[PDB]
Write a protein that binds this DNA or RNA. Sequence first.
DNA 1: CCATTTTTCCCACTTTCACAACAAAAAATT
DNA 2: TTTTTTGTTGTGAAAGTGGGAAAAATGGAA
Lengths: 273, 274
Amino acid sequence: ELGKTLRRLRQGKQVSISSLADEHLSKSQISRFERGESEISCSRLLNLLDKLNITIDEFVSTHSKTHTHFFTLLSRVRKYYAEKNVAKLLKLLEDYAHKDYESTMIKAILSSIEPTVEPSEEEVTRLTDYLFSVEQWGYYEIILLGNCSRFINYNTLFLLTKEMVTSFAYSEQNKTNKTLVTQLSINCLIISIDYSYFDHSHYLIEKIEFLLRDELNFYEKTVFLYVHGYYKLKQGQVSGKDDMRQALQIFKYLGEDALYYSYKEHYRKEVLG
Amino acid sequence: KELGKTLRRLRQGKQVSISSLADEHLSKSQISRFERGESEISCSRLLNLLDKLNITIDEFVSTHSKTHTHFFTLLSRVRKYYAEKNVAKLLKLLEDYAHKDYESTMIKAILSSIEPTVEPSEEEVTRLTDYLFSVEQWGYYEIILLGNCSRFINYNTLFLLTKEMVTSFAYSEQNKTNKTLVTQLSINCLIISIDYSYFDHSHYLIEKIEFLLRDELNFYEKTVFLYVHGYYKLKQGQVSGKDDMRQALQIFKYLGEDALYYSYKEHYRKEVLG
DNA sequence: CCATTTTTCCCACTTTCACAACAAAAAATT
DNA sequence: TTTTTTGTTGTGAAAGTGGGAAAAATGGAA
């Protein structure tokens, strides 16, 4: 089924079939694998792709755009959330009743725009119980934590955030997980400033600064500049209110009007009057 | 090649049964002996196994190995020795990769960043751009080669390669790493097109960059674009463009990006200040 | 301690692999 | 006309593949 695109990618690079032949796989099956009559070992497909310099990720995201079962769900909720359509939002709560963590997440997203339906305390505990179980956090766990984090009580939200920071999936070619973890640890830093868990705030500031080192995450760095400056404002440092004002000018200079008006409205509401 | 081992550690880490992942498509036992290096499963079935574990194929093969690819092994080792500014281990790595044409052409291009002696032949860069013109669909491999050798590619073919890359690169909506790079590379070729005032090239690149930035955060790409797009309006008889260039410089200042600040203000002071 | 779940070990039986010889088209020698 | 370069079939041999019985692991009762 994947043989076509292996044929289409290899013909597009104008390389022979027997270019890719080696000790690990004959030129034999390569002919029928590209014609859907045989299926190869996965290590040997990865070797074929290696000789073509094609990421396995590009391969399976250029063959189809029918994503993983998880990304179909997120596609479809962001689908209806941007459309504010509640009817079709509860549509997918019926398809995902047999999936616990997924169904807890829909209720969490739904109550942004419709407060009546909310996740049970028991469903959210079943979710955090699972998140506490996971030894290595991936995109799945990060999205689940981020989208339900306004129904997790603060103390367990921090403990889950700490576990996510310390045991998440790492690589220098795909920083999307690292970027998400950075945003999620800023989101729980701002809660720790409001409820003044300043020990948590200090811990998160050192983790956030480490996650932003050697990265072009300017958006995360700009909201961090504002939020860390708001912290230094409450910690007796006048530099902090300059950091908040510099962050507003970054939103202003970049035309990000939605972020500017939402952050300057909070600026003078907890600075002026 | 020992893909069951790491699948076992990922599956046990999520505390899920073997037979959760069992279905019509694969044994509940093959999973057990695939996980013990005694059998190797189809990759179609591995994508299904990973689907029920909610683990992206990208996370999976970047928890098994990370320098798994032949290409990323090279780049890691190049970024390692480049970060130490060590020419000895870099020129040794030019000898280990002598049998790879585009790869060793790329090393020479990076090597002369810190050591002007070695430069890519005009013939090697022509062999590279010839290959880039051949590729029907640009991937991470081609994008990195174009970006890391672009200061030895003459401008005219650099634009034509930039145009072909923008119009024919593969990007996933869950992994935007290729899309981010393509926008960085066509901003890099826009500012050169302004330096030569090829304003038709600048117009084409500006609208491609504007399209690539919609529904994205990418603040870094947006501030250098604010500088470069403002640099474009400066050469179009609009002083407003010089307000955009300095606003971008202050963004570099406010975010502590000293290296980018001195690199963009030095280009600012050479074509505004003289 | 035992009930239960989970994984490994043991049976037929299907598919895949590599060494092939196979035809066709390209490239080269007439 | 030839070779040479590329790709599509056939056939012992050796894997991959599913159901089930052992072995093991796990999780609470007394």
